């Protein structure tokens, strides 16, 4: 609505975590989650 927000509110990814053998965090940044109208302006391709 107003106060567009578009920021993380709920965390349903996983209920809990007990043992962690690895961790990594990137630098702070800000990504625009605001919706857009029209065609798809971004393309992301990943190989794992």
């Amino acid at each position, epitope marked *: *609505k*107003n*106060n567009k927000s578009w920021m993380e509110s*709920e*965390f*349903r990814v996983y*209920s809990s975590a007990n043992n962690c053998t690895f961790e990594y965090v990137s630098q702070p940044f800000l990504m625009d989650l605001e919706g857009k109208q029209g065609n798809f302006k971004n393309l992301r391709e990943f190989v794992f």
Partner: antibody
Amino acid sequence: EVQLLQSGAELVRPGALVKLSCKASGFNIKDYYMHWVKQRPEQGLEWFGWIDPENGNTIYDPKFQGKASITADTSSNTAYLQLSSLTSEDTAVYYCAGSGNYEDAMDYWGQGTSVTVSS
Amino acid sequence: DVLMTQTPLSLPVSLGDQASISCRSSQSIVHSNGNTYLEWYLQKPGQSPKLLIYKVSNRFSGVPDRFSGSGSGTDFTLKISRVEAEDLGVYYCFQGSHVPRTFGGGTKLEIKR
């Protein structure tokens, strides 16, 4: 009518802690947010924080940061607020709110618990 | 850290009259979808606050039809078409949004005589 059940009153000495219960009635707590409030006659209502039973995320007002932690019991659909490191200024009536009917617009409030910090 | 002030502090209204409680907010919470994140409450003497109106323009279920909220921008008011004895209490404004929630000072209602 959805209602939240809380303890009538609590008697706590300075420096000790209390645990305020908030039992769900007529709804499943897991599907709705839970909120807590502090009230004293001189200032009125003061917002404490909110908890998400299904996500576990909690937000606390700076006025109460470091004094309390919010949790809940999924099995009994009961929300708990722990009030520790209490002093005379913490004497207040505490309420819990939740059951927004699958919308972030509504909530239902219990009768409230009168917490007095005295010897 | 939202700041709001409720005017008037108190107001007596005789049975059958209309009550008006206004609140001013330091942040705009008016939305283009027709809803406004400000919940109205009534705290009857000796009872906990009870929700009256949710999102300003939508009446809460189980509340008498006399209760209805309206306003825009940062100024909003609660209108009671006809007031009764059971309406006695303190009316509070409750801003919503995705930021730490805030409470108002409250407005007291009395039955005029």
